[PDB]
Design a protein around this ligand. Structure first.
Ligand SMILES: Nc1ncnc2c1ncn2[C@@H]1O[C@H](COP(=O)(O)OP(=O)(O)OP(O)(O)=S)[C@@H](O)[C@H]1O
Lengths: 347, 684, 49
């Protein structure tokens, strides 16, 4: 019966079930496998259990004695599903770009959700935008707020999440996440800090000249090359502009680009009231003095400064926060800051 | 300061000493103590001691609620009867009394069932009214009606906060987290406090759920007291079930002569179609694009159906002739009724357009013409008469197909409280039970749709005779349970499932009927017992009861649909992949609908690849034609082109839209079954 | 001292295990090799891994 069929399928299997990546679709009941060291014979492939479901370059079950194709690999999962396969919205504290929000909207949601305009005005959707600037000003923050502000299930993909030194694990995660983006849904595969090709290295990593080079080749051929977009929103924002390979600076790969200054007085007071709200404010302290002195508050000093000001105060268990506590909080946060002459020597 | 002077005051049992330390305890109780009250194991020895032993119990409950307990903490308080908005008042009221009286009330609500607990509950409710804090006080005082009196004792000034937040979150957790019975008292007290309030839509959804005829009279006399009004009748008809519209129209016909015009018919549709021609502007090249699909007389059939459902005019109505002559018998049923689809308005125009196909040369022409006459409107009840007399044939005559059409059109048109004349004529419809499945199909369907939304259904003799005559001869056993469960609809606590298990259980046909009755008894609330029942009985060997039994999901758990995705596709009973396909349905089509459709689109069976476009294009009413072109590339037999045209159609709790797709859920049959497919009128 | 004939054949090494699974199987990181689902013993339960 069926139990006997399963017992026979197990009879075909050798107790030590090695693992070998398929090389090519050759269906004369034998394939050309590649185990952890690349055992590539014309080993038989079990016919009844699906022999042709898995593609070439995919892990399958292998024998030990003859390394025969034992079967399709088990359901494997990458360590990023919880971040990518997603189970703050527009703005919980309006007071920042107040515009790049709208622009990433028009560049991602409007194209993706209603792509009935690119034939309405002979146009093409933005296949890629880059957003960059200081180490935290409103680049990835907007993307995080855009994840909730969308009619689609966004995906979070840390640029370093794709750094696994296993053989082809780079291309493996490319394949997995892209089979997601294409055969899960029209998703929002957001990948940040993707500028990691320029001027550093790792200890938990081998020679990148020949380890992640073909990995990036696979990733590029996947995203904006072959098996092209269609409607697969995978936009690549950054922080820098320089250290990158111009193989993608050319359009097509990515079309638009956006930067991020640091917020202005109008937005300084905004994010102040956003953060200074977390404490019973001693209103005699002058936010505007902090705003003009710290006139280049990317967005970390504001948060850190107000949190540490609350800490300074509530160390004394006071409700109000005198100005000196704010001074100490900021100056601890704000090291190495000398904005006087120059200049410094004028008006 | 140091406890060295103030700690040893607990060793003596002096009455003046205790009674001058315990008020000092109240004074130092602003921060509790110098610390987290480590004076416990040195004061627990004083439990046996007995002037101000009320203050002694105050100190005792303070320190015990300061460390931990569940029952020994509130005893001193209920033994205290607290006597004798500050930070110390914050301490011993807000957080302390919250946790304290909360565990006390939970223990007394799960253990016994005195008045002292209601006293504490009222006192803390007034205290939190002074605190003005909802969303934790309300949700904690939910489980102790106590709720009704708390509402009518709190609802005086705060209108927005209480009503919006409390009512919405509690109704959400009442269809999601709370069971049904207490939601009835919720409904009653909300009805009261909203009769005290404005913004009638709250009472209108209170009626949408309660299914009440007093609420509709009150909201009508008040919405005449509060003079938009046309739009108000429009979405009153859009919100009302089938039971309350006839009761409301007759209780009005008893007593401005315009609420009769609005909330029965002919006024929800009077402003719509003109403004559709005005502000909506569809082009004519879609008629062609969807119509330029090469003629196949069955692909041409589906294309005629699609372009019949375009709605900027009735172009397809008057598109010459020979399109219906090209069609065949059941295709002629669909196309002669297609003219009613393009004309679901114009009461007078409906007759002046269909009388040319009424009583005409072809039997299918006249039957589908009566079908369209029933389709076009639901308030004229004058097109019923010319058919009602004919319907009787007793075996296999023209008026049997005309009876299919007109019985369905009258179940659609008029669905009163209990309309018996159509039932006295349906008794000869089921008593005949012509070999065509559609006869008994529409018999049960009309009986249900006029009996849906009933007061917990009914155990009346009609569906009982129907069960008898169905068990007499074993799609009949599939679509007669359709009407059975439809008559079961409107239930909140009906015992119909038990009587059906008593009379019906048999070989898996009537066992499937029993599980149909079960599916139509638990529309959805918090009753996860039946959910684990379904989880286990899904492993039943019968691969057919699985279908509807798991398809009940999209009804049971529709509100917080985030858990609706299950492992149905990961299951291997391919009918269960179709189950999930149904479970997606026709709503706004979230990205998770597309998540299912990503794989459910690419399928090979001409039945489930035929079941997926229905749900996909019905859930999305470039972006949308993308699965259309996807199927165009997927297939390029005839079923593939037919499902493609079905999707082309679909592209361009009300019971009105609850039955038809479950009726269609037996799609694996002939196009004669698809001959009655043109009855799914559920969109505006 | 007689027992020591066991000490002539195999000081079985530590094979890493990504995780457990049913069918009496796991995802063993064969430390100086790849991952290859292999057999188990009949002593501990599947969840134990
Ligand atoms: N709407 C907003 N516009 C601009 N800034 C905001 C906004 N909302 C919050 N912020 C602040 O901006 C910061 C966002 O920093 P992020 O860009 O998320 O940091 P990051 O992405 O880790 O930066 P790097 O380059 O990876 S170190 C937060 O710390 C917020 O305080």
């Amino acid at each position: 019966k069926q139990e006997e069929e399963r017992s026979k399928v197990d009879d075909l299997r050798g107790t030590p079930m090695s693992v070998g990546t398929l090389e090519e679709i050759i269906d004369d009941n034998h394939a050309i496998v590649s185990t952890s060291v690349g055992s590539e014979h014309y080993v038989s492939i079990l016919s009844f259990v699906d022999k042709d479901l898995l593609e070439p370059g995919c892990s399958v079950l292998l024998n030990h004695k003859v390394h025969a194709v034992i079967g399709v690999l088990m359901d494997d999962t990458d360590p990023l599903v919880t971040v990518m396969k997603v189970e703050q919205e527009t703005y919980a504290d309006i007071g920042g770009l107040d515009n790049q929000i709208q622009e990433i909207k028009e560049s991602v949601e409007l194209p993706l959700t209603h792509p009935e305009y690119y034939e309405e005005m002979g146009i093409k959707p933005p296949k890629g935008v880059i957003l960059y600037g200081p180490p935290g000003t409103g680049k990835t923050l907007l993307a995080k707020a855009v994840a909730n502000q969308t009619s689609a299930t966004f995906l979070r993909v840390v640029g370093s999440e794709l750094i696994q030194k296993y053989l082809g694990d780079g291309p493996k995660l490319v394949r997995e996440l892209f089979r997601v983006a294409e055969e899960h849904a029209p998703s929002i595969v957001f990948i940040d800090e993707i500028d990691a090709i320029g001027t550093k290295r790792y200890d938990s990593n081998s020679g990148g000249e020949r380890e992640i080079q073909r990995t990036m080749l696979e990733l590029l051929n996947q995203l904006d090359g072959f098996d092209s977009r269609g409607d697969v929103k995978v936009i690549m924002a950054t922080n820098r502009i320089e250290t990158l390979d111009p193989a993608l600076i050319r359009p097509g790969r990515i079309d638009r680009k956006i930067e991020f200054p640091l917020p202005d007085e109008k937005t300084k007071k905004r994010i102040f009231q956003i953060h200074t709200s977390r404490m019973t404010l001693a209103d005699d302290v002058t936010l505007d003095d902090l705003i003009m002195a710290k006139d280049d508050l990317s967005g970390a000093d504001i948060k850190a400064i107000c949190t540490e000001a609350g800490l300074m105060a509530l160390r004394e268990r006071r409700m109000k926060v005198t100005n000196e506590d704010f001074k100490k909080s900021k100056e601890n946060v704000l090291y190495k800051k000398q904005e006087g002459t120059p200049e410094g020597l004028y008006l | 300061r140091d406890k060295a002077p103030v700690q040893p005051q607990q060793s003596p049992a002096a009455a003046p000493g205790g009674t001058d330390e315990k008020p000092s305890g109240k004074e130092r109780r602003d921060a509790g103590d110098k610390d987290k009250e480590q004076e416990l194991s040195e004061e627990d020895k004083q439990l046996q001691d007995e002037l101000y032993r009320p203050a002694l119990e105050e100190l005792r409950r303070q320190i015990r609620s300061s460390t931990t307990s569940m029952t020994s903490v509130p005893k001193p308080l209920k033994f205290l009867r607290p006597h004798y908005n500050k930070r110390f008042a914050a301490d011993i009221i807000s957080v302390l009394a919250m946790t304290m009286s909360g565990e006390r009330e939970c223990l007394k609500y799960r253990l016994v069932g005195a008045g002292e607990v209601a006293k504490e509950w009222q006192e803390l409710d007034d205290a939190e009214k002074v605190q003005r804090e909802p969303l934790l006080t309300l949700v904690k005082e939910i489980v102790p009606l106590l709720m009704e009196i708390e509402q009518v004792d709190m609802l005086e000034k705060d209108i927005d906060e209480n009503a919006y937040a409390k009512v919405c979150l509690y109704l959400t957790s009442c269809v999601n987290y709370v069971p049904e019975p207490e939601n009835s008292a919720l409904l009653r007290c909300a009805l009261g406090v909203f009769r005290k309030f404005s913004r009638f839509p709250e009472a209108l959804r209170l009626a949408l759920m309660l299914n009440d005829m007093e609420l509709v009279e009150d909201i009508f006399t008040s919405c005449k007291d509060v003079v938009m009004l046309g739009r108000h009748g429009v979405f009153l008809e859009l919100s009302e079930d089938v039971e309350e519209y006839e009761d409301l129209t007759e209780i009005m016909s008893n007593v401005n002569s315009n609420f009769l015009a609005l909330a029965r018919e002919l006024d929800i549709m009077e402003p719509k179609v003109p403004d559709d021609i005005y502000k909506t502007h569809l082009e004519n090249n879609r008629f062609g694009g969807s119509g330029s699909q090469v003629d196949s007389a069955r692909m041409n059939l589906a294309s005629s159906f699609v372009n019949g459902f375009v709605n900027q005019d009735k172009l397809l109505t008057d598109d010459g002739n020979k399109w219906l002559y090209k069609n065949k018998d059941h295709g002629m049923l669909s196309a002669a009724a297609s003219l009613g689809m393009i004309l679901l308005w114009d009461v007078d125009g409906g007759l002046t357009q269909i009388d040319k196909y009424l009583y005409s040369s072809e039997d299918y022409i006249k039957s589908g013409a009566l079908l369209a006459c029933g389709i076009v409107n639901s308030g004229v009840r004058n097109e019923c008469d010319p058919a009602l007399a004919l319907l009787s044939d007793y075996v296999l005559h023209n008026s049997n197909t005309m009876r299919l059409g007109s019985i369905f059109g009258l179940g659609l048109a008029y669905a009163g409280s209990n309309r018996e004349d159509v039932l006295t004529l349906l008794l000869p419809v089921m008593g005949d039970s012509k070999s065509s499945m559609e006869v008994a199909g529409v018999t049960a369907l009309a009986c249900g749709m006029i009996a849906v939304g009933s007061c917990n259904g009914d155990v009346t003799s009609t569906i009982l005779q129907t069960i008898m005559e169905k068990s007499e001869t074993e799609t009949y056993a599939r679509w007669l349970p359709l009407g059975l469960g439809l008559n079961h609809l409107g239930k909140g606590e009906a015992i119909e499932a038990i009587l059906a298990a008593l009379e019906v259980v048999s070989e898996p046909f009537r066992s499937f009927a029993n599980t149909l009755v079960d599916v139509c008894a638990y529309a959805g609330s918090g009753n996860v017992l039946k959910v684990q029942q379904l989880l286990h009985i899904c492993s039943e060997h019968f691969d057919s009861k699985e279908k509807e039994e798991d398809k009940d999901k999209k009804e049971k758990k529709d509100k917080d649909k985030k858990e609706a995705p299950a492992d149905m596709g990961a299951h291997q009973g391919v009918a269960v992949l179709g189950i999930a396909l149904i479970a997606m349905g026709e709503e706004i089509g979230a990205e998770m609908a597309l998540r299912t459709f990503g794989h459910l689109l690419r399928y090979g069976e001409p039945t489930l690849r035929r079941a997926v476009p229905l749900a996909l294009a019905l859930i999305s009413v470039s972006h949308d034609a993308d699965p259309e072109v996807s199927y165009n590339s997927i297939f390029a037999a005839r079923l593939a082109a037919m499902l493609r045209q079905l999707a082309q159609y679909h592209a361009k709790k009300g019971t009105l839209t609850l039955c038809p797709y479950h009726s269609d859920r037996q799609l694996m049959s002939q196009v004669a079954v698809a001959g009655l497919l043109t009855v799914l009128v559920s969109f505006l | 001292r007689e027992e020591l004939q066991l000490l002539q054949e195999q000081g079985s090494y530590v094979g890493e295990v990504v995780r457990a699974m049913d069918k009496k199987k796991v995802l063993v990181k064969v430390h100086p090799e790849g991952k290859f689902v292999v057999d188990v013993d009949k002593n501990i339960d599947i969840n134990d891994v």
